[PDB]
Copies of this chain bind each other. A is one copy, B any other.
């Protein structure tokens, strides 16, 4: 119940996505990472506990409960999404510059463009 509520609150931030190949991508440190190379979902669960209310933060300091929240999260993800399809973009290490206005969206808006490759310098 409480852990399911915590998993539901995390699921509302769209920080974890499922790809068609059969893997998960996690939005941590302002970048879309990949699983199958060290588990990153529990790292995200531990790093997001500040946004959750106070009674939902002390529960996430327990490694076993974080695994329960992870198991809950992996069950609510049923629809797959594609990665890096938008042809007019230029990712950077603070966001993704657009290709028409010259605008450079960062942070919350940069999460919409699910990109795994990048230029390599700040902006």
Contact = CB atoms under 8 A, between A and B. Distances in A.
A83 interface: no
Interface of A: 1, 4, 20, 22, 28-29, 33, 35, 37-39, 42-43, 45-47, 58, 61-64, 66, 68, 71-72, 74-76, 78-79, 120
A63 B72 contact: yes
A12 to B, nearest CB: 16
How many copies altogether? 6
Given A43-B78, A63-B68, A79-B29, A58 B22 contact: no
A58 to B, nearest CB: 7
B61 A4 contact: yes
A106 to B, nearest CB: 16
